[PDB]
Amino acid sequence: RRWFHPNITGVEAENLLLTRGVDGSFLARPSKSNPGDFTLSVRRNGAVTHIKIQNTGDYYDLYGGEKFATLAELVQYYMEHIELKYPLNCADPTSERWFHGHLSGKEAEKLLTEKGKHGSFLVRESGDFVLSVRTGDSKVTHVMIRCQELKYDVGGGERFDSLTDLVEHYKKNPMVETLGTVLQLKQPLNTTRINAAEIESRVRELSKLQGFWEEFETLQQQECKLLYSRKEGQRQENKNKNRYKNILPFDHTRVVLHDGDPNEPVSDYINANIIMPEFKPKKSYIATQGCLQNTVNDFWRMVFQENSRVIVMTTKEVERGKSKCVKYWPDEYALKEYGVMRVRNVKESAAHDYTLRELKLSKVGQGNTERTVWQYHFRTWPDHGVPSDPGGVLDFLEEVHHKQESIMDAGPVVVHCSAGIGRTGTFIVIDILIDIIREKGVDCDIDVPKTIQMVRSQRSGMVQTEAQYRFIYMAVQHYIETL
Numbered sequence: 105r106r107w108f109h110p111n112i113t114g115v116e117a118e119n120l121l122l123t124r125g126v127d128g129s130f131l132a133r134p135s136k137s138n139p140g141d142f143t144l145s146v147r148r149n150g151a152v153t154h155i156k157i158q159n160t161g162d163y164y165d166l167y168g169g170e171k172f173a174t175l176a177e178l179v180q181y182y183m184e185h186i187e188l189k190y191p192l193n194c195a196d197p198t199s200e201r202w203f204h205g206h207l208s209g210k211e212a213e214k215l216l217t218e219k220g221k222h223g224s225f226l227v228r229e230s231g232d233f234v235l236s237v238r239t240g241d242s243k244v245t246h247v248m249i250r251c252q253e254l255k256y257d258v259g260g261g262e263r264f265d266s267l268t269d270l271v272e273h274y275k276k277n278p279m280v281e282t283l284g285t286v287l288q289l290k291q292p293l294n295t296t297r298i299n300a301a302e303i304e305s306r307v308r309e310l311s312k313l314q315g316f317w318e319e320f321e322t323l324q325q326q327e328c329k330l331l332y333s334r335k336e337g338q339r340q341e342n343k344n345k346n347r348y349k350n351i352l353p354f355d356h357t358r359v360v361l362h363d364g365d366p367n368e369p370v371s372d373y374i375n376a377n378i379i380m381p382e383f384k385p386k387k388s389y390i391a392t393q394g395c396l397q398n399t400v401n402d403f404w405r406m407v408f409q410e411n412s413r414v415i416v417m418t419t420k421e422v423e424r425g426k427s428k429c430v431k432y433w434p435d436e437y438a439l440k441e442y443g444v445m446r447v448r449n450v451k452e453s454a455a456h457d458y459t460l461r462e463l464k465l466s467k468v469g470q471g472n473t474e475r476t477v478w479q480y481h482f483r484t485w486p487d488h489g490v491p492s493d494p495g496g497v498l499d500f501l502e503e504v505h506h507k508q509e510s511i512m513d514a515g516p517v518v519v520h521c522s523a524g525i526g527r528t529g530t531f532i533v534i535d536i537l538i539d540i541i542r543e544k545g546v547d548c549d550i551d552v553p554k555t556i557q558m559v560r561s562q563r564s565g566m567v568q569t570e571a572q573y574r575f576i577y578m579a580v581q582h583y584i585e586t587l
């Protein structure tokens with residue numbers, strides 16, 4: 105993911121591609137004119153083309169292109185299918201997990217002493233730099249990094265173009281001390297894990313000139329490790345089963361549909377993934393896209409087979425004149441058959457922020473297969489961005505949690521929006537985090553980007569924007585404050 109430059113301007117991007125690039129050279133950057141948006145800058149026939157990428161929280165929408173779950177997936181697609189030939193690599197270490205910009209020597213040592221373990225390392229500014237590594241069962245070693253004529257070195261040997269290149273080299277080739285100590289750079293220092301009681305202090309330091317952005321962009325740089333196979337969703341027979349062509353379930357976590365019509369060559373596919381905390385069917389989730397008219401039967405087959413008793417719908421059926429999800433439930437008191445599944449809508453209960461629908465699901469032909477499915481439909485989420493206060497979402501997640509908990513042997517909770525990655529990802533992450541505080545008390549350890557990285561290894565692009573990332577912190581804070 106080196107083609108992503110987090111701090112360059114449109115002008116710097118232009119001069120970078122014209123002087124250091126060639127025809128086919130490209131890079132991507134956060135937009136300066138529109139904060140929260142992105143630009144893909146491509147060099148074609150001696151000139152630079154700037155392509156807008158918009159993300160309001162549901163997906164990356166390339167102007168004159170397609171819709172994608174991540175920026176790395178967008179790039180992989182155009183590099184394997186305006187030509188994107190050569191990534192123009194970024195040397196700026198700001199989004200590295202190990203880089204701590206302006207951190208003092210005293211602060212670095214206490215961080216490695218209180219939070220470190222064998223192989224824990226960080227890099228701080230001294231225009232020189234310091235590499236600090238902890239070794240043992242223990243001691244901290246400091247390695248000076250000289251910057252001489254735009255190149256970096258540890259006072260001998262190779263001279264690197266960037267700090268990333270130097271760190272990568274000494275990770276594969278560890279430095280050995282005179283008396284035999286191997287300075288192993290096993291993992292970056294974990295500085296994101298906080299005690300749940302200390303959330304207000306972290307939210308305060310992240311809100312200062314913001315820190316939320318640096319933490320979120322360091323998380324985004326790591327998405328290139330999550331380019332897992334999505335082959336089943338690419339099969340010809342499964343193409344019209346996807347709301348967005350390029351937003352596909354990972355094959356290793358996808359919901360596999362069994363007992364399908366024997367006359368149907370392919371009846372095992374749904375654009376849905378199992379999401380397991382720390383990767384029990386109960387405390388599990390199914391993140392899925394909003395139903396298409398041709399996937400409504402597959403959706404009820406999925407709900408039935410998984411023994412799900414609770415559905416969370418986080419979108420209105422229609423938003424900004426566009427279909428986000430088709431009505432997959434009957435009108436109040438009506439009974440509908442969706443293929444071999446039968447659904448009765450028993451009652452509809454309206455609250456301020458959401459609607460609750462009591463649905464009775466069963467298989468046609470078998471009376472004793474009947475179970476109540478509780479559908480919680482959040483209706484107040486803004487068309488763009490996140491709510492200004494997390495109170496509404498928290499009361500909703502509390503209700504959903506109590507329903508799931510009261511049901512013996514309940515299957516995973518089904519969570520869906522439009523693409524089933526943005527709002528869906530945000531609801532699932534908040535709910536994982538809150539469940540840790542429920543089970544272990546306010547005196548517990550939480551790590552927001554670790555939790556998101558784990559959920560993202562099970563479905564592409566879970567939690568889409570920095571606004572959602574910030575919302576997760578604000579929701580966890582509010583839960584703890586009212587505790």
Ligand SMILES: C[C@@H]1OCC2(CCN(c3nc4n[nH]c(-c5ccnc(NC6CC6)c5Cl)c4c(=O)n3C)CC2)[C@@H]1N
Nearest residue numbers: 198200201203204205295318319322323326553554557
């Ligand atoms: C300029 C800024 O200075 C400080 C700075 C660096 C330190 N830091 C931070 N941010 C993270 N965002 N995402 C992750 C992340 C990504 C992938 N996997 C995991 N965990 C899984 C168990 C492996 C995590 Cl935790 C982060 C991480 O590890 N760290 C330490 C805060 C921001 C910025 N360079």
